[PDB]
Design a protein around this ligand. Structure first.
Ligand SMILES: CCOc1ccc(-c2nc3ccc(-c4nc5ccc(N6CCN(C)CC6)cc5[nH]4)cc3[nH]2)cc1
Lengths: 103, 103
């Protein structure tokens, strides 16, 4: 009974943290999420595109070409980093407040 | 730049954790949130009613009369407890997955 919108949010947060670790292309990200989740999270390429199109429209990530047949890299934007920082900061405070409740 | 809906969610989570600690009446909850948040979170009674009417409609909390002029107590429901458990469980896994990303 976890809301579909919460699962979506968790998926977003995981993907944005992959990007936080470094700019990355689709197969790299998918591989990284699969390993980090112990196989629990195996995204398909089409799923990432749906998610990234929206994150990009929202100014949270952008993309550019690598080098060497070129790959497309996705990058967390500066606005993207700040939103994550504020979300992380505010949810840690929530954690601190609960902790206090439990003391 | 924290979304208004995320602040609302954080407020909900804090209030539900007050209730998780024990059934409680409005002034008790408000006092407890104010202390636990170091004065950062001072809710008014009307704000709680708006929030609790919706949580109750959603089957997450309920209310009943205490004893002794009676007070009205709010209680986390069994469904309420389970939803919190699942939300907590799934967000801890998200944390574990990020941790792995950072290793
Ligand atoms: C680019 C942005 O970057 C972001 C980075 C992190 C987050 C983010 N980190 C989170 C950590 C925890 C939660 C969260 N933990 C919860 C525990 C319980 C609940 N309850 C469950 C019961 N129902 C009734 C209310 C919600 C919600 C919860 N929400 C949300 C979170 N969102 C969002 C955006």
């Amino acid at each position: 009974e976890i809301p579909k919108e919460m699962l979506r949010a968790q998926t977003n947060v995981i993907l944005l943290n992959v990007l936080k670790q470094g700019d990355n292309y689709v197969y790299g990200i998918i591989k990284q999420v699969k390993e980090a989740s112990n196989g629990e999270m195996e995204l398909n390429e089409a799923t990432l595109y749906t998610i990234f199109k929206r994150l990009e429209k929202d100014g949270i990530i952008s993309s550019y070409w690598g080098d060497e047949g070129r790959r497309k890299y996705y990058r967390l934007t500066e606005i993207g980093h700040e939103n994550m920082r504020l979300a992380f900061e505010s949810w840690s405070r929530v954690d601190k407040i609960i902790e206090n409740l439990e003391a």
